[PDB]
Design an enzyme around this catalytic site. Structure first.
Site: not given
Ligand code: COH
Ligand code: COH
Ligand SMILES: *[C@@H]1O[C@H](CO)[C@@H](O[C@@H]2O[C@H](CO)[C@@H](O[C@H]3O[C@H](CO)[C@@H](O)[C@H](O)[C@@H]3O)[C@H](O)[C@H]2NC(C)=O)[C@H](O)[C@H]1NC(C)=O
Ligand SMILES: *[C@@H]1O[C@H](CO)[C@@H](O[C@@H]2O[C@H](CO)[C@@H](O[C@H]3O[C@H](CO)[C@@H](O)[C@H](O)[C@@H]3O)[C@H](O)[C@H]2NC(C)=O)[C@H](O)[C@H]1NC(C)=O
Ligand SMILES: *[C@@H]1O[C@H](CO)[C@@H](O[C@@H]2O[C@H](CO)[C@@H](O)[C@H](O)[C@H]2NC(C)=O)[C@H](O)[C@H]1NC(C)=O
Ligand SMILES: CCCCCCCCO[C@@H]1O[C@H](CO)[C@@H](O)[C@H](O)[C@H]1O
Ligand SMILES: *[C@@H]1O[C@H](CO)[C@@H](O)[C@H](O)[C@H]1NC(C)=O
Ligand SMILES: *[C@@H]1O[C@H](CO)[C@@H](O)[C@H](O)[C@H]1NC(C)=O
Ligand SMILES: *[C@@H]1O[C@H](CO)[C@@H](O)[C@H](O)[C@H]1NC(C)=O
Lengths: 552, 552
Positions: B172, B176, B353-354, B357, B495, B499
């Protein structure tokens, strides 16, 4: 006293201080080793020994016309040669960019802040024995004295390559989309955040300005009809700000992408022509795509005009400058199998190098009239009185001035020439010889070697004292011209990598963009690949007058 | 009725309307031809027949441990393998970027406007029969019904790879810095104009904010001492804007690079750790360069931390995620002889995609205490009470939830899950199967195949009716997990390209930057090469507690 003030690291090695009085050179991937990165590896010596000098290559490209005639008409050969021209030039360019005016070392601020011009050479450290490092006197010569004794025009020197006013104003119009110095901020800063050929000088730098200039019908740009001809809209109508003195009436305040293009009718001429070309392409696309909306028509037309611009600049503009018998080619496919970065950052030195003031004439000749600088500037009345056709016919036949060779800058722009020197010092440029070495050219060892002459070299000696203390801008203008050429060696060898990198580095040249669908199909794609300076004028100027970047 | 609504073009061919009734597929460099770019060329058929499935490859990489042990210890082979995984993945990404939410065709606006997320697939045209094109019902199923029936956690399903909270919060915190949706503007827009790993979540997005956070002494960032340890400064002290609810007292309003990191104590933990690491590196560099000033110390430390970040993400973070026996390697030199673009634009689908949760637990266990979401959110008092040492020890041992397999989203973040679906529709995402084909995966032919189970597939069939109508975000979370893995096939295959491209595309990986002088000498280089999640915590957390991305 910064240990790197002597610029000890050679062959693009990186200087780093280790302590208050010692330095260390990073020779990584230079091909050299040693304390100053001055000892060549085995493979390096071989490459150097076999590498022909720029002048030798220049001689070959400007002779054997019968040989190049065949090469030009055999795609296999022409492609291979053009591929060599592209690859060998761009390798001298740091991409992604490195330094700027505030950072002589690698930093995220220097990389990420697009408001800066980037820098091919790091700035001279703040506290050095001399302004340029260690070479020269404690104080550089008076900038006005340099201009007067070396740069000011005593007698008009015409360009032996025959460049005309169509060439001169194309150069100024084209480069002022990425040379947009934010002067209120400082010479280190630019307003051209796109950093390349985005045609912001036509469409505006921001979306807000673009929307003021657009018609929002058929993808077109706003315009007005005067005497049956298409001209840019007014400021009052678009509310798009422009730079105009109080004496210019409202109906003569033309609004275009670039805020300063009202300064001189030569710029407004090309601004009008490119405006006409956009709307012309819109009509073509609307015929091909009656199902498209205004937005897609606008965006696709813009991409096509970007393609036209790069096409014309390479195969007409650069072609003329080079003097090559070899015909340069715009073909993105030439790089699809090579290592190449599709991005560009405008360098401050590229800007300075492009200060081709000596191109300007003593008076501007339109039809049977002559105008001095005071009469010509901010005078759109002239453009309407004569029309674009007459402007093209006159400028095509009026010769421009020689850039190299010294003493050919019009006194009317004397303060501008001085400004180039003052700003260069403000941004702490390194010396002329340091830049020659940066682009793998042997440094000049005497003033006489620089000018190829005894008078101006004597004045240079009296001013600077040492050849390694001569500054970038004045040396470029006093450098010995190549035989019957407009430029000297350094102008070409330093300028060409910047120029070509910014052209081929454009996003539309990338594999994902360079395809018919990007430009609305084969019809739009063909418009790009068949563009020329002659077709641009023929398609958008009444009577289709002959034009060229050289005098008839 | 846009003729491209059916998305007729296959294999990354480009669809273009020609008239109201027809379309044309641009098959340029797709390796395919025919009307729909479906017919493979000669070499294409061969490559297809000699290329295995991702599930076969994944089996090999997760088995034969004794084999990979040998491979990992012979550099030449390890380099070749790692080089291949870098080039092959990054090839699926368009660079320079193309589409965004407002443009389903190439345009200068889509390329140049950094405020947009870019798009791996163009948005569904406005005038299509169904929301996804032509497939599915005229109206998409209620987003809240999708969340409740398919996504909501009944019983906590732990990750079989044993990912912990140190992993969940690292992901996270790390993502972010480039997933920074400007929600007041729309989900299509980002506040992360750097579009990658610039560590703006530490230093700030702009210079103005950076200056508020810097100490301007020894290159360091501002900090305070609480209970003898280093913590971020406050909003009152720095005057740097942060997002905090009214109930958060002034002394608990910590100021960091990312405005939202006060939301979760887990984010503020890593913010504190990276803050300490910056000031630590400043101490190292100052010992190496007593002659350096504050500005150079700050900038050099930032570059080093960027290096550390990429190193840790590849060799610890992605390494854990993959479950491979092959040891991944961060080494920019692996790409120096390859075609690679050193740039990056963050894609909207990469963001969606990321949305992991399901990683989130039912409660947050710190030492002997349990906190629910009401107690944990925006509560920096918890961080000060336990300290970073207790945080690391607790989060290292608390297991995270499984991402794929469905029904594992905490009810506490139910609306976030619904928002992901709603935003995707607002941005007019194409279907799940379209994105599979975009990344060279075979489309699922039935709901049962997608889930590998009869329960949720039946629920899916009732909601969507067609497998080609299932949306990206819900299908990712309900997809059959790979054997004892945290993810399903699609998550990894889509992903990983985004990435890895964002990591190796970083400018410090470029040849001009990847050298000792860039990082202050060999000492700076060694900090990067010795970087790990373990050393990050050991160097900056009191007592040097053991940590990992998996439960011991
Ligand atoms: C390349 C050819 C070229 C030509 C033909 C040309 C022709 C002319 C011309 C013709 C009537 C006049 C009155 C001037 C006068 C000026 N030039 Co030029 N200039 C040229 C290259 C440049 C460049 C490059 C700059 C720097 C622009 C910057 O940093 O914004 C420049 C700057 C200037 C400036 C500073 C303000 C500004 O333009 O933003 C003035 C004034 N000038 N020049
Ligand atoms: C590893 C991934 C991860 C984790 C651990 C995580 C952990 C947590 C967490 C407590 C630890 C809470 C309270 C939330 C709650 C939220 N998250 Co996440 N989220 C994650 C992935 C994302 C992503 C990706 C976004 C969208 C980024 C954007 O556009 O700003 C997001 C956005 C949000 C939003 C705004 C909605 C939106 O942007 O669409 C909320 C609210 N969340 N999340
Ligand atoms: C690596 O680069 C060094 C920096 O250029 C260079 O040192 C320089 O050497 C020259 C002459 O060898 C010195 O020039 C002046 O030296 C004395 C002053 O002490 C004068 O009396 C001379 O007349 C001459 O003008 C520079 O001062 C000196 N610069 C320094 C030391 O910073 C090294 O020699 C180079 N090494 C190699 C192996 O190439
Ligand atoms: C990148 O794209 C952005 C989205 O199109 C764009 O933002 C838009 O900017 C324009 C002009 O600044 C704004 O236009 C109008 O905004 C309000 C309406 O809310 C009016 O009152 C103003 O007078 C103005 O006419 C848009 O609102 C704004 N849209 C969004 C979603 O923010 C950026 O400008 C683009 N970036 C660049 C560099 O051009
Ligand atoms: C790029 O660099 C310029 C110059 O350092 C920054 O402009 C400065 O911004 C600060 C804070 O907003 C002001 O206090 C200074 O007066 C500005 N200086 C100048 C010369 O304008 C600019 O903010 C940087 N860009 C970004 C995105 O951070
Ligand atoms: C057009 C000249 C304006 C500047 C004059 C003052 C600076 C001295 O300019 C002088 O000009 C002479 C004639 O060109 C040259 O022979 C001298 O080398 C030069 O010093
Ligand atoms: C501008 O050019 C016109 C020629 O049409 C001339 O009459 C006028 O005096 C010039 N100067 C101005 C308008 O300041
Ligand atoms: C191409 O696709 C369209 C729609 O998917 C289909 O109708 C058409 O028959 C296809 N053409 C070929 C040659 O397969
Ligand atoms: C925040 O945490 C403290 C203990 O660290 C606790 O006393 C307090 O009740 C928490 N706040 C909320 C709103 O639960």
């Amino acid at each position: 006293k910064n240990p790197c003030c002597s610029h000890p690291c050679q062959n693009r090695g990186v200087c780093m201080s280790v302590g208050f009085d010692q330095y260390k050179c990073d020779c990584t991937r230079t091909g050299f080793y040693g304390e100053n990165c001055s000892t060549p590896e085995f493979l390096t010596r071989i490459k150097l020994f076999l590498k022909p000098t720029p002048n030798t290559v220049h001689y070959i490209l400007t002779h054997f016309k019968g040989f190049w005639n065949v090469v030009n008409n055999i795609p296999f050969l022409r492609n291979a040669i053009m591929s060599y021209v592209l690859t060998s030039r761009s390798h001298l360019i740091d991409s992604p960019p490195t330094y700027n005016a505030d950072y002589g070392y690698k930093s995220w601020e220097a990389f990420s802040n697009l408001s800066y011009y980037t820098r091919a050479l790091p700035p001279v450290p703040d506290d050095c024995p001399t302004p340029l490092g260690v070479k020269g006197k404690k104080q550089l010569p008076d900038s006005n004295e340099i201009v007067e004794k070396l740069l000011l025009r005593r007698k008009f020197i015409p360009d032996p390559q025959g460049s005309n006013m169509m060439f001169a104003f194309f150069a100024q119009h084209f480069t002022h989309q990425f040379f947009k110095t934010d002067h209120k901020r400082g010479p280190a800063f630019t307003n051209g955040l796109g950093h390349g050929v985005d045609l912001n000088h036509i469409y505006g730098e921001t979306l807000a300005r673009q929307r003021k200039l657009r018609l929002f019908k058929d993808g077109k740009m706003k315009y007005q009809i005067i005497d049956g001809e298409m001209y840019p809209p007014t400021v009052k109508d678009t509310q798009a700000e422009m730079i105009y003195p109080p004496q210019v009436p409202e109906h003569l305040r033309f609004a275009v992408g670039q805020e300063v293009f009202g300064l001189v009718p030569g710029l407004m001429m090309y601004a009008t022509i490119w405006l006409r070309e956009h709307n012309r392409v819109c009509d073509v696309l609307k015929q091909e795509h009656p199902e498209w909306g205004d937005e897609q028509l606008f965006q696709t037309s813009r991409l096509i005009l970007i393609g036209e611009t790069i096409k014309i600049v390479i195969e007409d503009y650069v072609q003329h400058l080079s003097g090559y018998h070899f015909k340069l080619k715009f073909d993105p496919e030439l790089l699809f199998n090579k290592q190449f970065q599709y991005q560009n950052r405008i360098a401050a030195e590229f800007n300075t190098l492009y200060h081709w003031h000596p191109l300007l004439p003593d008076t501007f000749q339109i039809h049977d009239q002559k105008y001095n600088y005071q009469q010509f500037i901010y005078n759109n009345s002239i453009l309407l009185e004569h029309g674009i056709t007459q402007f093209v016919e006159s400028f095509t036949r009026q010769i421009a001035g020689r850039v190299a060779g010294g003493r050919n800058v019009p006194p009317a722009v004397q303060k501008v020439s001085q400004a180039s020197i003052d700003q260069s010092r403000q941004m702490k440029y390194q010396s002329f010889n340091e830049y020659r070495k940066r682009f793998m050219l042997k440094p000049y060892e005497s003033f006489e070697e620089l000018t190829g002459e005894k008078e101006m070299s004597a004045e240079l000696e009296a001013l600077y004292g040492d050849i390694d203390a001569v500054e970038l801008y004045p040396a470029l203008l006093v450098e010995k011209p190549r035989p019957d050429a407009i430029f000297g060696e350094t102008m070409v060898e330093v300028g060409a990598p910047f120029s070509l990198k910014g052209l081929m580095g454009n996003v539309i040249c990338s594999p994902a963009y360079w395809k018919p669908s990007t430009f609305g199909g084969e019809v739009g794609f063909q418009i790009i690949n068949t563009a020329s300076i002659q077709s641009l004028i023929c398609n958008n100027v009444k009577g289709c007058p002959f034009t060229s970047f050289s005098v008839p």
